[PDB]
Amino acid sequence: LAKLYKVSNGAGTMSVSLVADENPFAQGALKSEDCFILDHGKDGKIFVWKGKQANTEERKAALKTASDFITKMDYPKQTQVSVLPEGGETPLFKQFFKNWR
């Protein structure tokens, strides 16, 4: 099962927190103020979703963390993080969500 993480410094430190571990995810789980990491790394699918109002530190932290997941969770070494902006989501990303519209 995929997991969805929030990457945010809104609470006073940069934090990577779990927001969803049941599949499929709510489309409204993606909040424009932050970045999110969708981890389905077992088959090499890891996404960074960049909320339009996230800040530079959050974007940088989400990319670094998603890349770190490859090493720390022992995902396939050729895994490439898929980076998506809010509003530029691909079918492969949307398939993880319930009734994306």
Q: Are 46 and 82 in contact (CB under 8 A)?
A: yes
- Cα 10 to Cα 19, 36, 94: the distances in Å are 15, 13, 26
Q: Would you say 8 or 65 has its CB closer to Ca ion? A: 8
Least distance in angstroms from the C-beta of 32 to Ca ion: 9
Return the range that interacts with Ca ion (CB under 5 A); candidates 10-18, 20-28, 75-83, 92-100: 10-18
Q: Are 95 and 101 in contact (CB under 8 A)?
A: no
Least distance in angstroms from the C-beta of 5 to Ca ion: 14
Least distance in angstroms from the C-beta of 74 to Ca ion: 30
**Residue 10 is a binding residue for Ca ion (CB under 5 A):** yes
Q: Judged by CB under 5 A, how many residues of this single chain contact Ca ion? A: 4
**21, 22, 33, 68: which one binds Ca ion (CB under 5 A):** 33
Q: Where are the beta strands (DSSP E) in the chain?
A: 3-8, 15-20, 35-40, 45-50, 81-85
* Residue length of the chain: 101
Residues near Ca ion (CB under 5 A) are: 8, 10, 33-34
